[PDB]
Every structure is written in structure tokens, then in C-alpha cells.
Amino acid sequence: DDWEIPDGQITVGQRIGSGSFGTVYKGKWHGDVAVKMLNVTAPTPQQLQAFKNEVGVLRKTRHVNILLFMGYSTKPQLAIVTQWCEGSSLYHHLHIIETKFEMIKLIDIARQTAQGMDYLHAKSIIHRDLKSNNIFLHEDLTVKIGDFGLATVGSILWMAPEVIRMQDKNPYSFQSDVYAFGIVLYELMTGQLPYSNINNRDQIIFMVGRGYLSPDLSKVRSNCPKAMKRLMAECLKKKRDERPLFPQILASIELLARSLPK
Numbered sequence: 001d002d003w004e005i006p007d008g009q010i011t012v013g014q015r016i017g018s019g020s021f022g023t024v025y026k027g028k029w030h031g032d033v034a035v036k037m038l039n040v041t042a043p044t045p046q047q048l049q050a051f052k053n054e055v056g057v058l059r060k061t062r063h064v065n066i067l068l069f070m071g072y073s074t075k076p077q078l079a080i081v082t083q084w085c086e087g088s089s090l091y092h093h094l095h096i097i098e099t100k101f102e103m104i105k106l107i108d109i110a111r112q113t114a115q116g117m118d119y120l121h122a123k124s125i126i127h128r129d130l131k132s133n134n135i136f137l138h139e140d141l142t143v144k145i146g147d148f149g150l151a152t153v154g155s156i157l158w159m160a161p162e163v164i165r166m167q168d169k170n171p172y173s174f175q176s177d178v179y180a181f182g183i184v185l186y187e188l189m190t191g192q193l194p195y196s197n198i199n200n201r202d203q204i205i206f207m208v209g210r211g212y213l214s215p216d217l218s219k220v221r222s223n224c225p226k227a228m229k230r231l232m233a234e235c236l237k238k239k240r241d242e243r244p245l246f247p248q249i250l251a252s253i254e255l256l257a258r259s260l261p262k
């Protein structure tokens, strides 16, 4: 049953980038896998803890739309092994290679991301770092929500105002996750990162916190359904309690889906 992998089983190859608390690599372990690794000579109890935390979280997830946790290793170094996604993250698709997705597809990406979160929230798992960087597109047609380093039971554009102005003790809730999802909906419908016309970060932070700046929703592409625009505004509510929860969100996306191809 248990998920530890004995030393020497994980062949670590190409370095591909970074995730929360570690470096990501493409590896082999009964096929292609992704490997997030500490690569520190000796781990701090600080690091040891965030590692044991994440593993504990991942092992409660088993879902199409949640990046499949496969195993962990503490042996050569601290490392988490997950399935491989050939074809890049949603952030990369949108703001790096500039994939021009069709609308029908964009809504389906949004329908799966919603689907995955509903699952996590049903299991009382707050992601706390949802962004397009953490939304992976497996073989170009299947959304896998990844990176649970911050989840519970640095990147500010997806952060709800409440979270931005650090008060009280815990600003992170289902509602804060909904906000994050709201911004990825923005990226999808606009093909742009929010506040793109402001070049000062500490201004964007300040301003979102005091609520002087919200995402400019009149930038959604003309064939984005009125129903979809409405849901987006609902997610990006400054007051957190005026946001819907994912069960209600998902329903809306599935209703606008059926009345689209016709």
C-alpha cells in the first residue's frame, strides 16, 4: 500500500523549472513522471514539515482533474513523484507561446478547473496558490490541477484582496480559492494577465488591497457568453462572502456549456 519509493528507483533527468519548495524534473519511474525535488544536502525541520504536509494532502486526492500523485522519496533527497503531462501549463499556453484557443475549448478548460476544485473543497482542501501556472494541460485536452505545496486541510495576481492586505491571522478560505479561479477565468476569456497596463507591482499590491483596482472585465472577447461574464464578476467580488462556492460555480459552467454548440 504505502507510497515510499526505495532509493535507486527514480531516474532523474532534465531539469524543467521550479515549484513550491523544490526543483522540478522530468523523470522515469514505470514510464514518464514529473519529479519535484529539494536537492538540499540536509533538510531543515522547516522543510521536512512542508514536505510531509504536501504528501499528506496529495494522498487524499484521486481525481481526473487533480495531478495524479504517484509516490514520494526521502532517500537520496526529499522528492514527490507525479504523472507526466506532455504539453505545457495553462500560463505557458496563454502568455508565452500564445495559443489561440477556440471559445468552446476555453470554457471546457474552465469547466475542468472548476471540476477539480469542487473535488478538493469537497475534501476540505484549500489550494492557496491556484494560478494558471498550476493548471496543467495533459495532451492538450485534459486539465490537471497541480502543485499542492501551499495547500491545507509569491504570485500576487491571483490573490484575493483579503489575502493581499495580510489580516487577520488566516485570510485563506474556499472563497479566496474561488477568487483565484476568477482570475484564471479572466486569463481564459481575455488571453491577458490582469492589470497588464500597470508596470509597478507595489502599486498593484497596494491598490487591490484597498480595493481601488479590480480586473477590467470589459476586456473579455466579444464571443464570450453573457452568462460567463456574469460568473466572472461573481467570483471577483471584493467582499469574500459575496462569492459563490464551487458546487454552484460548476453548475453554471455546465449550464452555459449545453446551450453553446447550438
Ligand SMILES: CCOC(=O)c1sc2cnccc2c1Nc1ccc2c(c1)=CCC=2NO
Pocket: 016, 017, 018, 019, 020, 024, 034, 035, 036, 080, 081, 082, 083, 084, 085, 086, 089, 136, 146, 147, 148, 149
Ligand atoms: C516549465 C515549468 O513547468 C513545471 O514546473 C512543470 S512541467 C510539468 C509536467 N508534468 C507535470 C508537472 C509539471 C510541472 N510542475 C510541477 C509542479 C508541482 C509538482 C510537480 C511538478 C511534481 C510534484 C509537485 N508538487 O505537487
